[PDB]
């Protein structure tokens, strides 16, 4: 319905060639994607995908 | 700090998942598939934020 979409941060790496860190994240269904995440997010955090 | 946002380029309700899947474009031009909340449409912007 109006549920939330979250993903646990499995892996995190600061790449000089990017302007936000890159994270391997695991969504609810167990699928893992590489995405950008805000500075300050660390391995073991949970990020939320939200509509602005 | 600096917010992380991405444009929803494409979107698809797969019955094999419990949230719709989107192709999104991050500010670096990179396009990744992720889950987005029910309600977002093509052209919306999503934020990735730590809860």
Author numbering:
A (entry chain A): 4 to 55
B (entry chain B): 5 to 55
Quote the original article:
To demonstrate the hypothesized interconversion between the DZBB-fold and the OB-fold, we created their chimeric proteins by combining the design-1 and OB proteins. In particular, the OB-domain of rL2 from M. kandleri exhibited a high similarity with design-1 (identity 25%). The sequence region surrounding β2-β3 of the OB-domain in rL2 was incorporated into the corresponding position of design-1, based on the superimposed structures. Through this process, we constructed six unique variations by modifying the positions and extents of insertion (design-6–11). Biochemical and crystallographic analyses revealed that two of the six chimera proteins, design-6 (tkoL2_v1) and design-9 (mkaL2_v1), adopt four-stranded OB-folds. The DZBB and OB fragments comprise approximately 40 and 60% of these chimeric proteins, respectively. Therefore, the monomeric OB-fold could be reconstructed by simply combining the DZBB and OB-fold protein segments, without optimizing the structural interfaces between both parts. In contrast, the reconstructed OB and SH3 proteins did not interact significantly with any oligonucleotides.
Here, we study fold transition between distinct β-barrels by protein engineering and structural biology technique. Here, we discover that the previously reconstructed ancient DPBB sequence could also adopt a β-barrel fold named Double-Zeta β-barrel (DZBB), as a metamorphic protein. The DZBB fold is not found in any modern protein, although its structure shares similarities with RIFT and OB. Furthermore, the reconstructed OB fold could also be converted to the four-stranded SH3 fold by a simple circular permutation. Thus, these ancient β-barrel folds (DPBB, RIFT, OB, and SH3) could be readily interconverted by a few feasible mutations through the missing-link fold, DZBB, indicating their significantly close evolutionary relationships.
